Structure 1
Amino acid sequence: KQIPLGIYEKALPAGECWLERLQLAKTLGFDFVEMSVDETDERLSRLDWSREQRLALVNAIVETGVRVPSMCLSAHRRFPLGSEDDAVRAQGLEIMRKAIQFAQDVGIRVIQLAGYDVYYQEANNETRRRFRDGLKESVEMASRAQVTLAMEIMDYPLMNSISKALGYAHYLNNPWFQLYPDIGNLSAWDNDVQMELQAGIGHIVAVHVKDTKPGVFKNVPFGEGVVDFERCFETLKQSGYCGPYLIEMWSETAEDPAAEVAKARDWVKARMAKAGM
């Protein structure tokens, strides 16, 4: 009767002591934190951490009891796998290799992939093909290492539904490729959200919890968007989902991040409770 609840790294204060980060998450009542490896040189430099830095993270996790089971790899927005610039695409694949090695090192269960063929450039048939082939190569790296890659449902039309991610799953036909729906992103298009959630059961390994509006996929306060949280929670519970939920928010920049996080936590937990969890 346990429901693992997590908080996005970027909801908490920015300081790079992981022991304190994990200790804070613990006091706020979270079971885990999801690491961000984003477009910043600073967070990307984590992939070049020394052995001692990697083992310090493991130590902090074992000592606090607060896991880092997942990594959001949004760095691919900057170095996408579908880039027509072969130099950019090579660094995207290199980032993928290092993220997988990083996950092996520190015991990260799931690398959440960004479903962008290109983000800053215009998409075409070539970027789609290169994204597909880059994704296949990534999944082969993941197969060797035995590390799960889970495709996020995106703020972007290529990967804006569970159905589209399932299309990729059928193509790859690999146990290390799974689904990480974001119920906010899933609700901000023209999807039959409740059917999508049910359809993805069997491949859903984690769920991002955030609110959205059409065209607005970031920093929409809980309750001010279009997400039907209770219905999504009901669908997932009734279909047999037993995995974690991660509250995605960016309260890093707030006057009091911990206070913002605590409010969102209680808000989300109330909707889970209503849905029988």
Structure 2
Amino acid sequence: QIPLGIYEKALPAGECWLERLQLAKTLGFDFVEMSVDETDERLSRLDWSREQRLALVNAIVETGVRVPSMCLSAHRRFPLGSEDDAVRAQGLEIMRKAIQFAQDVGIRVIQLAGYDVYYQEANNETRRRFRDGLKESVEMASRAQVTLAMEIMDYPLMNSISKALGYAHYLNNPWFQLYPDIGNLSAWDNDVQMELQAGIGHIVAVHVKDTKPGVFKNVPFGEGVVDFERCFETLKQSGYCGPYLIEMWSETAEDPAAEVAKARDWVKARMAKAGM
């Protein structure tokens, strides 16, 4: 088996989760990755009532479609490296609330964004604050027993598996792992296939998307520089047995389901070629 998931933001935008999960099932997916992004609407999920949390658990159990991971891109707006101590405190409360939320609804993995700061310029001060924020986050994670997994990013601080492995060695904690995005990994000057193999005992999930140098969003599958077949071959041959998540933003398309179905078959053909 190869568990295959779809990004929340590839599907229609309604906060109706049972409908979302039914659609994913219909489209042939095993799971949906939730996004808790910079928007107040998705951020407000962290303030959901017990009944709202439990309704999500209900929909998951009823449909069989899991929500095993949360993409926590809210830290782009409230980064852990902020020299604004108010903004940083806000990033840390979001982290705490995301961990409690994951405990409540049974999310397995919180995918962290490797930004020390995004909208502000980086320096030694922001990197040190990010490092300390990350250590604090992993401590909360260790208490809760919730996996935090650093994504390989559209940003120089975390633009390879190697740099994430640096953080993993520093932290030396079972609850801090790796969540490579093969698109982001391919959009710099990395030896991608060597990076995938190097990270193996730390890789808990894989984001599947295409990219170009300096273009990390909305590059159509096949129009970028990602060698999908090679990546899948490397991961399979190195013993990877975890999930793959198709990352796309077709929520805005005329027919989101149709865009998703085409990307699904496209991605699946390449996995099949790679022996999976």
Shorter-chain TM-score range: over 0.9
1:63: how far off?
Answer: 0.1
| Residue 150 of structure 2: aligned partner | 151
The CA deviation at 1:230 is 0.1
Distance in structure 2 (CA, Å) of the matches to 1:225 and 1:40: 28
Return the offset for 1:275: 0.2
Give, in whole Å, the separation in 2 of the partners of 1:23 and 1:122.
Answer: 42
Cα shift at 1:218? 0.1
How far 1:99 sits from its partner (Å)? Answer: 0.1
Deviation at 1:266, TM superposition (A): 0.2
1:177, CA displacement in angstroms?
A: 0.1
- Name the structure 1 match of 2:57: 58
Question: How many Å apart are 1:114 and its aligned residue?
Answer: 0.1
SS in structure 1 of the partner of residue 139 of structure 2? helix
Question: Matches of 2:82 and 2:269 in 1, distance apart?
Answer: 42
Any unmatched runs of 5+ in structure 1?
Answer: none
Q: For residues 44-68 of structure 1, what are the alpha-carbon distances to aligned partners after superposition, in whole Å with 9 as ceiling and x for unaligned? A: 0000000000000000000000000
Cα distance in 1 for residues equivalent to 2:267 and 2:130 = 34
Q: Distance in 1 between matches of 2:169 and 2:23?
A: 40
Name the CA distance, whole Å, in 2 between partners of 1:185 and 1:57: 30
Q: What is the Cα deviation at residue 21 of structure 1?
A: 0.1
Report the RMSD for the aligned CA atoms in angstroms: 0.1
Shift of 1:240: 0.1
SS at match of 1:205: coil
Q: 1:158 deviation in Å?
A: 0.1
Cα distance in 1 between the residues matched to 2:137 and 2:243: 24
Deviation, structure 1 residue 144: 0.1
Task: Look up the match of 1:196.
Answer: 195
Equivalent residue number for residue 231 of structure 1 = 230
Aligned residue pair count: 276
The separation in 2 between residues aligned to 1:74 and 1:206, in whole angstroms, is 16
The alpha carbon displacement at 1:155 in A equals 0.1
Instruction: Determine the C-alpha separation between the residues in 2 that align with 1:10 and 1:89.
Output: 26
Per-residue Cα deviation, 1:21-60 (whole angstroms, up to 9, x for no partner) = 0000000000000000000000000000000000000000
What is the CA distance between 1:10 and its match in structure 2?
A: 0.1
In the alignment, the residues of structure 2 paired with residue 79 and residue 115 of structure 1 have an alpha-carbon distance, to the nearest angstrom, of 12
Shift of 1:71: 0.0
Q: Deviations over 1:242-275 (max 9, x none)?
A: 0000000000000000000000000000000000
Aligned to 2:133: 134
Mapped to 1, the partners of 2:60 and 2:237 lie a distance apart of 32
Cα deviation, residue 124, structure 1: 0.2
Which consecutive segments of 4 or more residues in structure 1 shift more than 6 A? none
Partner of 1:110: 109
Distance in 2 of aligned mates of 1:216 and 1:119? 16
1:64 and 1:149 map into 2 onto residues whose CA distance is 26
Q: Distance in 2 between matches of 1:81 and 1:88?
A: 8
Q: Distance in 2 between matches of 1:14 and 1:250?
A: 11
Deviations 1:63-107 (A, max 9, x none): 000000000000000000000000000000000000000000000
- Deviation digits for residues 98-127 of structure 1 (CA, Å, limit 9, x no counterpart): 000000000000000000000000000000
Give the SS at the match of 2:201: coil
* TM-score using structure 2 length: 1.00
Alignment partners' CA distance in 1, 2:86 and 2:32: 32
User: Residue 202 of structure 2 aligns to a residue in which SS?
Assistant: coil
Paired with 1:254 and 1:110, the residues of 2 have a C-alpha distance of 28
Residue number in structure 1 paired with 2:74: 75
TM-score (ref. length: structure 1): 1.00
Separation of aligned partners in 2, 1:62 and 1:168: 35
1:154: how far off?
0.0
Q: Secondary structure at the match of 1:258?
A: helix
SS in 1 for 2:137: helix
Q: How far does residue 183 in structure 1 lie from its aligned partner after superposition? A: 0.0
Same amino acid, percent of matched pairs: 100
User: Partner residue of 1:260?
Assistant: 259
Structure 1 residue 194 displacement after superposition: 0.1
CA distance in 2, matches of 1:180, 1:15: 27
- What is the rounded CA distance, in whole Å, between the counterparts of 1:169 and 1:152 in structure 2? 12
**For 1:202, what is the secondary structure of its paired residue?**
helix
